[PDB]
Amino acid sequence: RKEREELAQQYEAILRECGHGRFQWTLYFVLGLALMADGVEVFVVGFVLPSAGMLGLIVYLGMMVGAFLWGGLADRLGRRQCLLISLSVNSVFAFFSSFVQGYGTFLFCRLLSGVGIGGSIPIVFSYFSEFLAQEKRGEHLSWLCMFWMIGGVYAAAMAWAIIPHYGWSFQYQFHSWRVFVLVCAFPSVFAIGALTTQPESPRFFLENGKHDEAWMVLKQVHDTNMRAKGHLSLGGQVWGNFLSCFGPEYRRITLMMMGVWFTMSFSYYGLTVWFPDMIRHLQAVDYASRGAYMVYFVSFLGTLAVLPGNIVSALLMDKIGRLRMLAGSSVMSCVSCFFLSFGNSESAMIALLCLFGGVSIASWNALDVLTVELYPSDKRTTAFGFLNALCKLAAVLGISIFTSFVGITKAAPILFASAALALGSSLALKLP
Ligand SMILES: CC(C)CCC[C@@H](C)[C@H]1CC[C@H]2[C@@H]3CC=C4C[C@@H](O)CC[C@]4(C)[C@H]3CC[C@]12C
Ligand SMILES: *[C]O(*)C1(*)(*)=[C@@](*)(*)[C@@](*)(*)=C(*)(*)C(*)(*)=C1(*)(*)[N@](*)(*)[C@](*)(=O*)[C](*)C(*)(*)(*)([C]*)[C](*)C1(*)(*)=[C@@](*)(*)C(*)(*)([C]*)=[C@](*)(*)C(*)(*)(*)([C])=[C@]1(*)*
Ligand SMILES: CCC[C@@H]1CC(=O)N([C@@H](CC)C(N)=O)C1
């Protein structure tokens, strides 16, 4: 009641006293490594597992399980400790999958690494947010979403360089897809190695009755900023946390948030996995009328296209508003997806999905900052993790359907995603 509000006000006051600029900008990279690992795994699942009947979409079920699990645990065990555990699991099994002599065993040891990386985004966003003050929280949570694209481009370049060929078979030994799989673990290994040097969030320590082990974290933040400026029953506890997200105070918020998350993720993941298929079909039909580098090129161009949108969102959200930014950017993403149909030619279709990405990254940034503004640290990571599990389910729902529609229908998935984003924007415009 009064204790929670007093704690939130006092923690915001102390966090604003600690200052911003050095500790936060270091933890930003330390956690961007984890997000880059997330993007790497997502790329390998969506655009490299088919290269070996949509059996690669089992890794997304793994990721949904892992997101829910690690998100729920991170609110009881710690944001940093559970980020360590999740990244460690992902890294160990991404390592394993390269030494494995099959696909029935490679897919399992990669499903478990997908489970690992499932809980990266919820914990990273809930963990970085415990260190950021109110007037910088949105702007500095918006820069994280670029590391996802950086990880995706990393994965695409490694694929095009080590395994540009479609040959991917496990039996011989010391292949070149094994080298790729090992090399795609590197962002995760660095993320965990760097993350073992950042302190667990002070908000979590305060919530966990650890006032001293929170004061040490806070004094570290202050000293780092200034010197550089100058001078089980645990399952029952996680269930309580989750069933609170649908209490009288969070049922409305949680349901509308679930809808926005699910629809945005459905549209985005379906569209982005379909678009290379659309390009390949377009060029195959063009050839009939008369590889991995194409996916790398479009990955690079998309990573550059979300850039101005990410910068504008990050710099503006503190004044345009998180609710308003989410609503407007979701409307713009809907309309740009509707326009995506016109790009009759590949040369023009690349640019229309560039537009989709550029105008939709602002909605994603607003969503990720809003799902941390609307929940308390007592349940922030559980709520974020559940909503990210919904995002992974949407990603399967969207990648399966749209891939099914590749050739048989021309502007089917464009219209599916336009309607989905319209529903998502309708829900987003209603949030508090
Ligand atoms: C190179 C191009 C494609 C980059 C485009 C960047 C996007 C993300 C930018 C450009 C103009 C921006 C919009 C300008 C003004 C507003 C105010 C209000 O209505 C809510 C957000 C909204 C609607 C902004 C959302 C983000 C926005 C759509
Ligand atoms: C580089 O983006 C990422 C990030 C993580 C995983 C994969 C990946 N690449 C893709 O999904 C392939 C898409 C075609 C990239 C893309 C996305 C958007 C919104 C616009 C463009 C032009 C390309
Ligand atoms: C335009 C790119 C949107 C991507 C898709 C995705 O899944 N993103 C994560 C970033 C941690 C998110 N906002 O949840 C961002």
Question: Domains in the chain, please, with CATH?
Answer: 2-223+241-428 (1.20.1250.20)
Tell me which ligand sits closest to the C-alpha of residue 46.
2
Pocket test for ligand 1, best of 320, 333, 369 (most atoms within 8 A of CB): 320
40's CB contacts (< 8 A; 6+ apart) are: 151, 152, 154, 155, 184, 187, 188
Q: What phi, psi does 390 have (nearest 5°)?
A: -60, -40
Whole-angstrom distance, CA of residue 333 vs CA of residue 359: 6
Q: Which of 227, 212, 175 lies closest to 26, judged by CA?
A: 227
Q: How far is CA 218 from CA 119, 192, 306, 316, in A?
A: 25, 22, 34, 28
Pick left, alpha or beta for residue 234 (phi over 0 → left; psi -120 to 50 → alpha; otherwise beta). alpha
Residue whose CA is closest, atom 9 of ligand 2? Answer: 299
- Nearest atom in ligand 1 to 310's CA: 8
Residue 373: count of CB within 10 angstroms of its CB: 16
Q: How many CB atoms lie within 10 A of CB 290?
A: 4
DSSP letter string, 80-112:
HHHHHHHHHHHHHHHHHTTS-S-STTHHHHHHH
Q: Does ligand 2 lie within 6 Å of residue 357's CB atom?
A: yes
Residue nearest to atom 16 of ligand 2 (CA): 302
Angle at 56 between CA 283 and CA 148, to 5 degrees: 80
**CA angle, corner 25, sides to 23 and 30, nearest 5?**
90
Max CA distance (Å), the chain: 74
- Tokens 């995002």 — which residue? 391
**CB-based contact 118:62 (threshold 8 Å):** yes
- CA of 298: how far to CAs of 257, 292, 294, in Å? 30, 10, 6
| Token duo for residue 235 | 């399952």
Ligand 1 midpoint to CA 335 (Å): 13
Residues of the chain by 3-state class (helix, strand, coil), percent to 5 = 80, 0, 20
Ligand 1 within 6 A of CB of 325:
yes
By what technique were these coordinates determined?
cryo-EM
Structure tokens at 313: 């969102």
Nearest Cα residue to 148 out of 128, 121, 182: 121
Helix (H), strand (E) at residue 272: helix 251-289
